[PDB]
From a paper:
To elucidate the oligomer states and the interaction mode of OsCyc1, we determined the cryo-EM structure of OsCyc1 and finally solved three OsCyc1 structures in dimer, tetramer and hexamer forms, at a resolution of 7.9 Å, 3.5 Å and 3.7 Å, respectively. The six molecules in OsCyc1 hexamer structures were labeled as chains A, B, C, D, E and F, which can be divided into three dimers. Two of these dimers assemble like two sides of an isosceles triangle (molecule A/B and molecule E/F), and the other dimer (molecule C/D) lies in the center of the isosceles triangle. Our analysis showed that the cryo-EM structure of hexamer is almost identical to the structure observed in the asymmetric unit of the X-ray crystal structure of OsCyc1. The catalytic centers are located at the outside edge of the dimer, tetramer and hexamer cryo-EM structures. The interaction between dimer C/D and dimer E/F is identical to the interaction between dimer A/B and dimer C/D, suggesting that a pseudo-twofold symmetry axis exists between the chains C and D. In addition to the abovementioned interactions in the center of the hexamer, a linkage exists in the γ domain of protomer B and protomer E, which protrude to the edge of the crystal hexamer structure. The interactions between chain B and chain E occur on α11 and the loop between α2 and α3, including key residues D298 and K302.
Numbering used by the authors:
A (entry chain C), B (entry chain A): 80 to 767
C (entry chain B): 621 to 767
The structure:
Amino acid sequence: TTTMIDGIRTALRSIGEGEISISAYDTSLVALLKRLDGGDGPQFPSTIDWIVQNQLPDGSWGDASFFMMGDRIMSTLACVVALKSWNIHTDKCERGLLFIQENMWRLAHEEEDWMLVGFEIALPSLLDMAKDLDLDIPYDEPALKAIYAERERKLAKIPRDVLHSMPTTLLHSLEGMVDLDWEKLLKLRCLDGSFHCSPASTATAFQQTGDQKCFEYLDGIVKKFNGGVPCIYPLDVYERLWAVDRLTRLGISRHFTSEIEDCLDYIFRNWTPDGLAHTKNCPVKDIDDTAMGFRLLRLYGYQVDPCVLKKFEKDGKFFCLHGESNPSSVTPMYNTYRASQLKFPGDDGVLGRAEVFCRSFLQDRRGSNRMKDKWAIAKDIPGEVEYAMDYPWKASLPRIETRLYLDQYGGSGDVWIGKVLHRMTLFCNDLYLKAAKADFSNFQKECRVELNGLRRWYLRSNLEKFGGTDPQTTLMTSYFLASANIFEANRAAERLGWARVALLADAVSSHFRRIGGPKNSTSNLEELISLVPFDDAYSGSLREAWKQWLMAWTAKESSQESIEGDTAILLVRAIEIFGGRHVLTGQRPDLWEYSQLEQLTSSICCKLSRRVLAQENGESTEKVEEIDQQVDLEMQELTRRVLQGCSAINRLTRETFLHVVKSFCYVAYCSPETIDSHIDKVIFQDVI
Amino acid sequence: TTTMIDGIRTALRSIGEGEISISAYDTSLVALLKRLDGGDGPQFPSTIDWIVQNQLPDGSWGDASFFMMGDRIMSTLACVVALKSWNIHTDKCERGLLFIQENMWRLAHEEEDWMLVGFEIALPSLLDMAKDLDLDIPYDEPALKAIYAERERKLAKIPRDVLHSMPTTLLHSLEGMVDLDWEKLLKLRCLDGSFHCSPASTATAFQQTGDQKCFEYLDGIVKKFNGGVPCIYPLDVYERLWAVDRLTRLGISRHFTSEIEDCLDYIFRNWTPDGLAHTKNCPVKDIDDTAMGFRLLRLYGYQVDPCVLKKFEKDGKFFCLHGESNPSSVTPMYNTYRASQLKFPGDDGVLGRAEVFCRSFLQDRRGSNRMKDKWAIAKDIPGEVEYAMDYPWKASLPRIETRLYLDQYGGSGDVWIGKVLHRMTLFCNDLYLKAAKADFSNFQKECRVELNGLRRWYLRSNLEKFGGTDPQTTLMTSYFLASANIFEANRAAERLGWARVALLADAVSSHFRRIGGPKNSTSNLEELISLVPFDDAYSGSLREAWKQWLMAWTAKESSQESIEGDTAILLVRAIEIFGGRHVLTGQRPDLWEYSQLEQLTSSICCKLSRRVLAQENGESTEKVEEIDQQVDLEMQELTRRVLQGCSAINRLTRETFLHVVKSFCYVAYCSPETIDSHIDKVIFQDVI
Amino acid sequence: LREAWKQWLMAWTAKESSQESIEGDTAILLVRAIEIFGGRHVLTGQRPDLWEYSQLEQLTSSICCKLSRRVLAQENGESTEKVEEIDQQVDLEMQELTRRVLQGCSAINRLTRETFLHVVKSFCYVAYCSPETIDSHIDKVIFQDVI
């Protein structure tokens, strides 16, 4: 009920470190260690106290909600070569490798998509030491003549100079590389002690170089997890970004105003002009973390340098990694195109050069299956992308996709791959949906009785008579854009009062052209403003805006520009009376930048409505994308005042300036068919 | 009864466009119309199937519970000149033509004006198509040239030329009008195309001009309405406008408040300034259907206007018809007496000009037996209007109007007038009488058990130490005035609060009628009220109204005003706190609705008691008329505030102000010998 | 403010054809107006207090009309018997009005109750002060300076 929001709070009140599934391939690699005394033997025999309980009837390991033997082989032969060194509990290995003989012909049958890290590289390092004990296993195999022969055709191409002088990503999987040096390569480590944040790449060196200061990397893991080891630790800032990236896309984050910035507190201290990574103590950066942080650092309003992308592109090619090539997966280029829209005109042109890459990169790849990822599997990854390419940030309502994000999100039925596949429950649950399919569902419930209540007032106050062809389609259109922006149950008085004066100014806009302007109108028009009920805290200064609005028609008598943008000054000034909020009076730049914001908001809709008249004449395109090349810069200049804290006017009045003008950008970018779908999706058809 | 209480709901929510009987004369006019697709027989064979198989073996056609051959010859002679003409089952032609020629002698001695509309002009239209078949038709009858003389006087009462400049109501029976210009007719039809919305016009249309649009109308009401033609379709603004007039007059409408709101809006969706017809799209409109729905909509807080009644004032006259001055029935003028009872002083005086007409129109024809009802046969014409005219709206109680209403309605016991004696089955069903009279029957036990329940309270509380004149008449009349305004069973509790605390104020009146007041009585009477059924939910609430009332007995002592101007505010102050509903703080007009209301009722009953202190004193009627014309004007504004839709004050808190002065306005206009004739009816002489 | 103007304007059409004057609600136009310019909101969250603010307008409005036919007969004196009798009906309606404003066992604030006293005292004094005297009061209080 309400405690589901409490449970995520207590799952966020205690953020120490990551929630990752405990792995088994490196559990054999840590359990294969002699004691420093040597009498105790294995160092942490809790690993044996974990394996003989975490097991299924075929003796197998891992993907207990799936089936993939290509990783499961790497935990079924590793667990038995750890079971014959100390040579305890020989009861289920002889059946646990006998099942592999049943499926030693099921090896080469998985697709090109699932090729794990260390596959042709780190797996033959298991096999030649498996036969060090010479257990009953088919060594040669005609299916294995790919990982055998093209072992070298993966590794002999990289030079031994660049791996003995320069730090690159090959320090994670290092068992496949042999005859290396330890004394000259020990100054190119990670910061906490690891070799690229993987304990196997410590344990491959702890056997030759017993670095006691690196023993405390593993000893700290078996103390914190109380036995057992996962494949990657730590994941502190990988945890933080994927927490909040789900939260604002799901739409439950607005209860957590204390907590949401607290993650952003840890990022702004560790932000650098070079980049950031999965953990903080890793040198080799990438593209994902620099990009997706910037879309979340800038959004809540922290000034963040937009020049970090200059490292991660070269020669007109935006690479996924520093110093190493990539067959470009979608999971960089999705969120790289997402942060390619929050731009300011004062920024560097590298942000311009990114979106001219990804749109050329993602438009063509929609037909064939090149949009798949080699590192994930989930319910709908590409379905989000086709929405993001055609619905930009400038015209998206903040409610339409929040309904659609439910229809694309699997939850904890989605698995990440690595060396060993795993899940993340501080990140994905079946509970974030339970919070979302509770509060959004009753919001969908509690708002459709409001339009039921908003119906009859329109049909009783004598105003429905004239205007359009039918009242009902204008009634549901005017409440959609007036409630998709403000969606919480405490500001309904602003919400419904918006939608009323929305329907007031347009049926009288219809009435003036039907008589030909205000030259031959005789009925008094300042008395229609009283059909809104009298309240004391609101309706005093409300009527002052309608009076000053009336003379814009006498101003636009015999002058042939459109009259849409000045009607936005109705909405942007009436609504704040329903919030009872002045500007802060005594501060003159507060007086200034409100007026500076009022001008540009009135200036978008002159450009937009003239475009709609220019396009519906069937005129050519080389002028109507010029209007798109004219309002692309008056949209981003609107953002710099909103996002950056340009003066001390409180944020509450600043969302609404953007909340009105995005709605007018939405009407002029959706055909009259496709909004009638979105009305039918988010309002009526209930979730569960 | 849940079969019947929901049974009205399930029947009155399946409202199509009415349910009326199949005609026997218009169905004859469409049966002779053949196919047009190169066929052999009729276009509509299932209408002649309804002709063949419905018939009652007495020989005639028409209605079942009436024998007026003024209807039957239109139902026989037109019907038998069709199926013989198509030569389809002429076996039953002699079956019908046998009994006519020896029973058509009764046509000579008929009644003057129980004749069908357009009977005297459509029967000579049958003669040229009867001698087309030339059966043994005895034309020798004095009802033949005497209507020929009326026919050529109807070729002298209708004009040819000026008729095309404006439509008139004779387009419902236009078979007596032939050989005219038809492209001048084409711009004189409604959007159904059928002239005066009647199917008989289109039979003449397919002799000249094969328009598709006058065909699909007739084809849809046979092929989708399952054979046979009605007399006028549709009937949507007659079946909704009268069923709300009938069901609310029963008084059992309280269980249907979800439903009466909707059909009233379809009245308002069809609201026009030039009136409301018997159908939705008629190009001609009446006054009686106009000035009835006007009255009902004002009685439910809607926004109406009586400025639309300058369109039937015939220079100080009124008529049912728009252009002609024919002698009408009483029910146009009966309805305009109902609507001119209540008004607001911001209007035209046309309702004054009509009420001085509608009294003086009905004043003489009450005194004689001139109760001619030309368009409706019903049970009790003069006795109902004798209740309506000889009892005013200011003293019209909601229960001495429903107890009398179980006397005049029959349900199936009516028959309606059109071109065919037809019937309705929706609002002319007596199935409600198995419910509503049983609702009064369980109402009668719902008031009987508290007759004795307030007898024993008068003894056990012992108020007879200063009781007064006569208990059993005055305990009853206090409960007559308390049960004649609140009778819903969920609110049966606070009704007993009314009749109880009223007599307490009558008791201390009989204490202070002769002992002066506070200057001779040291009696406290503070906690002496608390012999009432008393809760802590009335923790102080009765005491502050009490001592303020005794302060009026203190202050107005040795004055000469009425000491019932304080009792009137006291009762509703007592009634509401028994019912337990509070006002909000709200805006300033909300108490301004309150504080202007309580001045009006404190002025009227103080004014009203002057007349009771004048009639028995026997003074001049100039003072009587100058105490009546003043007390009517205080009423005429007062009724607006209790009957608006714009009231911020709560709904049921409003009409309680109306109810208590209604009892004050009643008993000043009645005698004790007319009052027992109401007491023995609504309490003692039960139904059934 | 302007609804009380609208409530005063609709009360014109109440006595549009009647024989009364507009004085019995001109004060209600003014006793409401001091609460506006001043923001003095009433607390009707309790039932007996709203029963008193309604009752406070009961006393004033009858006085204003009983003074109205007083002064229009005062210029005439067509019934000199009732001239010394209308005002002996008036005073014992003032006698109860000046009770409830002066007393304190109510729940209304102190400063807003004498506003009821302030309107009728401005109203009653000009009914008893001749036009020869109302000017002779003004000059020697507000124009002819002290010290």
